[model samples]
Target: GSVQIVYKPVDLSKVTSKCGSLGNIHHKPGGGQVEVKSEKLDFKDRVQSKIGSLDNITHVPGGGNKKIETHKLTFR
Candidate 1:
């Protein structure tokens, strides 16, 4: 038997992981942003990057077809 999961659209501010589960959030030094990518989406894909700031917020909000935000982060 196989299991199927569905994706539900929602507010970016509400995106989260279940209890006891976590995802990798990479933040480059001086880049001013964090990114979340996955290699298991419809045969591999990426998600919108989250802006990095002292505010400590992770909201990737945007309107349809609008220019998505991608912060410039660096890795040493």
Candidate 2:
């Protein structure tokens, strides 16, 4: 019913993450080359088409000869 997404820099930062006298630490994780591509798709194909539903349609924008794809969403 819900989704959360997070993205971080390729370079990592170290900090005293905890509260105590012994909180400081070294050799923490650092940077790497990373290009993350992430997406979460929810396909809820039901007999009732419950709650949220979607249909894809393509049409020309500005009433021109160009075509653009879009989704039509409805709620039950």
Candidate 3:
């Protein structure tokens, strides 16, 4: 049977993994919190260089696009 379109929107919308943290939040001594940025931690730049945009999402099934194969990562 088909599932609901908005099934558990809170949990489903949450983009989490079994490995490292995707967010880079830092604590500021003077006041509140701050966002941390790193070259290696830049997923924005990483995804852009790879697939680029939604149209470049040919890595998924039913998409007969390019030579990009789906690569599943294992958590250690």
TM-score for each predicted model, relative to the true structure: 0.14, 0.14, 0.13
Tens digits of lDDT, candidate 3, 1-76: 6544433323233333354443554543333454656667445444645232233221323323344335454544
Tell me, by lDDT, which candidate is best.
1
- Shift in Å, residue 16, candidate 3: 14
**RMSD (Å) of each candidate, 1 decimal:** 23.4, 27.9, 21.9
Give the whole-model CA lDDT for all candidates, comma-separated: 0.48, 0.45, 0.41
**Per-residue CA lDDT of candidate 2, range 1-76, in tens?**
9755454336454433333354434544545454535495466665452333344454423323434545554545
* Span of ten consecutive residues with least summed lDDT in model 2: 58-67
**With candidate 2 superimposed using the best TM-score fit, by how many Å does residue 8's alpha carbon deviate from the native?**
56
- List pairs with backbone clashes in candidate 3: none
